[PDB]
């Protein structure tokens, strides 16, 4: 979870993603609120189909004391799945998202008991 990796599927060709990567990364930064304490990093880009591309990201957050660390994957996924944020993501061409952290049974039970 500490590695903070979120996989995103885009309904865009790989060449289009790479061709405008600066813009894509900044738009993701804007979705996060645009503060200078958050930085979006691209871990990888992979074609999945003619017009489907997976983009793996993480977000580095800086503390008031200058320390930096990655936003945990579960925390970042939780933000992106919020209805308002998901809609903004869909406007960028995102059609899905996944975190790598395998949740514990108690975490899963909590999510089922409180799906919202």
């Amino acid at each position: 979870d500490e590695d903070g990796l979120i996989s995103l599927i885009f309904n865009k060709k790989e060449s289009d993603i790479r061709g405008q990567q600066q813009q894509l990364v900044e738009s993701l930064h804007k979705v996060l609120g645009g503060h200078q304490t958050l930085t979006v990093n691209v871990e990888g880009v992979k074609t999945k189909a003619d017009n489907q591309t997976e983009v793996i990201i993480y977000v580095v957050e800086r503390s008031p004391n200058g320390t930096s660390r990655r936003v945990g994957a579960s925390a970042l996924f939780s933000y992106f799945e919020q209805a308002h944020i998901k809609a903004n993501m869909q406007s960028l061409g995102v059609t899905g998202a996944m975190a790598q952290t395998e949740l514990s049974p108690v975490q899963i039970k909590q999510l089922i008991q409180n799906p919202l």
Partner: nanobody, 124 residues
Framework: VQLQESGGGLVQPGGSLRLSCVVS?????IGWFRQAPGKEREGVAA????????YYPDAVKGRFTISRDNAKNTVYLQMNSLKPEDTAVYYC?????????????????????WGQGTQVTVSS
């Protein structure tokens, strides 16, 4: 989490089959995946434990339905109007990673827990 399927068989075109899988352990996502001879595993149905949303590829829409009886810890795949192109080994699989969208619900790559599979053959 452990999975064991049942319900496969030899089916005539237009016929029905109902698969079952008994599940032990908690999961975020569970689905059915099929693999025809020499081909890749493809997702045919998935469900979210969090909100009960379901996902299907167009090729089985209206014909396949995934459901659960949580009392029995069992998930089902009801398959109607079967066609020879549906012939395959069918697997139940589960995973504990969060996701949204059909791609990650239906991609076999994104499930870590696999059943043993049950054969489904559709022929006249």
């Amino acid at each position: 989490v452990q999975l064991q399927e049942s319900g496969g068989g030899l089916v005539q075109p237009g016929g029905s089959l109902r698969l079952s899988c008994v599940v032990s352990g908690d999961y975020y996502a569970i689905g059915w995946f099929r693999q025809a001879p020499g081909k890749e595993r493809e997702g045919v149905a998935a469900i979210s434990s969090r909100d009960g949303s379901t996902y299907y590829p167009d090729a089985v829409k209206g014909r396949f339905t995934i459901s659960r009886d949580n009392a029995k810890n069992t998930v089902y795949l009801q398959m109607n109007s079967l066609k020879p192109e549906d012939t395959a080994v069918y697997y139940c699989a589960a995973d504990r990673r969060q996701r949204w969208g059909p791609y990650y619900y239906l991609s076999a790559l994104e499930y870590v827990y696999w059943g043993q599979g049950t054969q489904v053959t559709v022929s006249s």
